[PDB]
Amino acid sequence: GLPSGWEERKDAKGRTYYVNHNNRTTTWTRPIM
């Protein structure tokens, strides 16, 4: 699925976003690699 250290989650409106546990950031953008 996702590259190492990354987690897929959902916000309060059900919208998918991504959690970067390597650098402690979040983004709407799915990581490519």
């Binding site: 916000d11 919208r15 959690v19 402690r24 979040t26 709407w28």
Partner: peptide, 11 residues
């Protein structure tokens, strides 16, 4: 608007 913030307690 932005996504939820990183969960800082999880650090």
């Amino acid at each position: 608007g932005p996504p939820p913030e990183y969960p800082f307690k999880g650090m």
